[PDB]
Amino acid sequence: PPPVRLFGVEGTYATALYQAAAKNSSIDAAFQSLQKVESTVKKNPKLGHLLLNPALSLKDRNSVIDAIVETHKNLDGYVVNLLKVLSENNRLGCFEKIASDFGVLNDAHNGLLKGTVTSAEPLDPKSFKRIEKALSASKLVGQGKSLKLENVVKPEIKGGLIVELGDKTVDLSISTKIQKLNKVLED
C-alpha cells in the first residue's frame, strides 16, 4: 500500500512504484540506482537532453530504454520494468518527475524530514547548528523524524529568513514587514 498520496499527475506512477517496491523492503536501493542511471542519460549530452521530449517513435525510445539497462545492470527489477511502461506510453520528459516524487516517498520511509531554511544571506555555521537544535525542541518536529537543514541564498528575501519543513513554517522575515508597511503609509 502507499502510506499517503502526494503529488498530482505523474505521481500515479510514483505511488504505484513505491507500493510495488514496498513488498520487498528495498525502495532505497531502487531510488539510488535510479539517480545513478538518470545521471548517465544526462552525461549523454546529445540524445539525453535531445530525447527527453517526444521526438522519435515509441519503439526507438523503447530501444533507447533497452540500451540504458544493458549498460547499467543495477537498477532493481521494479525500475527496469517501470522504464518499459514509460517508453510504451511514449514519455520521457516527466522521467525526472517520477524520480523526484519517488525520492520524497522514499525519504518519508527513511524518516527524513527535508527542509529549506532560506535566508537573505548565508548564515554562520553556528546559527545553523542552533536552528537544527531548536527546531527539534519546538513541537513542529515531535521527534521520530530527522530534520535536515538546507541553506539557500535568496536576495529576494530582503532581510530576515524563513524556516520551512513539512506543513509547518515560521516566517520571521523583514521583507514581508516592509511590503505591509509600504501599503499602510497614509500619514
Binding site: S119, A120, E121, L123, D124, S127, R130, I131, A134, L135, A137, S138, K139, L140, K158, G159, G160, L161, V163, V170, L172, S173, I174, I178, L181, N182, L185, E186, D187
Partner: protein
C-alpha cells in the same frame, strides 16, 4: 484653496519617501549583515516558546 489643502497631503508624501529612502540606507550598510544574525537568534528564542 484647493491647492492649499493639496499641500497638506503633499508634505506627507514628501516624508513618505524618507521611509523608502531609509530602507535603501539600511540595506546599503552591513547593518544588513548584522540584523540578519539577530533574526536568526530571535527564531531560536521563538522556537523555545512554541
Amino acid at each position: 484653496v484647493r491647492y492649499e489643502a493639496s499641500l497638506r497631503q503633499l508634505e506627507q508624501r514628501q516624508l513618505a519617501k524618507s521611509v523608502i529612502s531609509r530602507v535603501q540606507s539600511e540595506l546599503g550598510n552591513p547593518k544588513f549583515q548584522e540584523k540578519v544574525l539577530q533574526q536568526s537568534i530571535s527564531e531560536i528564542e521563538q522556537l523555545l516558546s512554541k
